[PDB]
Amino acid sequence: DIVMTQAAFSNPVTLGTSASISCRSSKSLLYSNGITYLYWYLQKPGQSPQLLIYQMSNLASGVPDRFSSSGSGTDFTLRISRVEAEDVGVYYCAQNLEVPWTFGGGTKLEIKRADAAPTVSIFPPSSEQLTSGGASVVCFLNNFYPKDINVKWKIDGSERQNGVLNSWTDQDSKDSTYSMSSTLTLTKDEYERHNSYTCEATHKTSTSPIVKSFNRNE
Numbered sequence: 001d002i003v004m005t006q007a008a009f010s011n012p013v014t015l016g017t018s019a020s021i022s023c024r025s026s027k028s029l030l031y032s033n034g035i036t037y038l039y040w041y042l043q044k045p046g047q048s049p050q051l052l053i054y055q056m057s058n059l060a061s062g063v064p065d066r067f068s069s070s071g072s073g074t075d076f077t078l079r080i081s082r083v084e085a086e087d088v089g090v091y092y093c094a095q096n097l098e099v100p101w102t103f104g105g106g107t108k109l110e111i112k113r114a115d116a117a118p119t120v121s122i123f124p125p126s127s128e129q130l131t132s133g134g135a136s137v138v139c140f141l142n143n144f145y146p147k148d149i150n151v152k153w154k155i156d157g158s159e160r161q162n163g164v165l166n167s168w169t170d171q172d173s174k175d176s177t178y179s180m181s182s183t184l185t186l187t188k189d190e191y192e193r194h195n196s197y198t199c200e201a202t203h204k205t206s207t208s209p210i211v212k213s214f215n216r217n218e
């Protein structure tokens with residue numbers, strides 16, 4: 001079978017400038033009839049893949065001329081002109097010169113927007129979770145860029161790393177920001193043995209961490 005190779009990540013692209021997604025095939029995709037059997041699909045965050053370009057030079061319905069594909073029989077690039085925030089997602093190349101259809105690994109397009117610092121919220125366990133015996137503490141960091149960010153938990157002044165897990169959203173379709181939750185998972189019993197709960201978010205927008213704290217007994 002034919003192998004389609006593409007890089008997982010792109011250089012972050014500025015709104016209004018040009019993005020390029022590369023793809024290469026293990027065999028030429030140019031058939032003796034003059035058609036190159038290359039396709040481009042876009043998978044947007046939370047959605048199924050959808051066709052952008054078919055057989056190199058055809059624009060799928062409702063796709064603007066901003067998208068264009070060119071290349072040889074083996075080396076291809078998708079060009080996206082005047083990229084908009086809603087262009088974010090994973091771009092897949094594909095071939096059906098031969099059976100079976102095969103797909104590249106996908107390349108994520110990232111929007112390079114101006115840095116933005118996170119808005120930080122801390123959430124003590126609710127009475128409902130406590131009734132269940134659980135005491136997850138959540139620190140939410142909302143609408144920041146770029147994606148890389150560090151959260152530190154302090155419990156009564158001592159750093160806590162065990163039981164802490166971080167998870168991000170995808171880049172937002174409109175404001176091109178990320179959000180992430182840091183969750184400290186504790187039992188009610190563990191939770192009720194300390195008073196002060198702090199999360200500290202370190203991001204490149206500042207040298208000072210943004211710090212949120214609460215006291216369990218308030």
Ligand SMILES: CO[C@@H]1O[C@H](CO)[C@@H](O[C@@H]2O[C@H](CO)[C@H](O)[C@H](O)[C@H]2O)[C@H](O[C@@H]2O[C@@H](C)[C@@H](O)[C@@H](O)[C@@H]2O)[C@H]1NC(C)=O
Nearest residue numbers: 030031032033035036037054055095096097098099100101
């Ligand atoms: C080995 O030949 C290729 O086989 C693939 C998979 O069967 C064909 O793709 C399917 O074609 C049928 C129609 O024959 C339907 O369109 C399916 O949805 C396709 O998955 C290749 O056929 C080419 O590509 C299709 C999208 C059509 O445009 C078709 O006319 C083309 O020939 C077929 N490719 C070649 C080089 O023969």
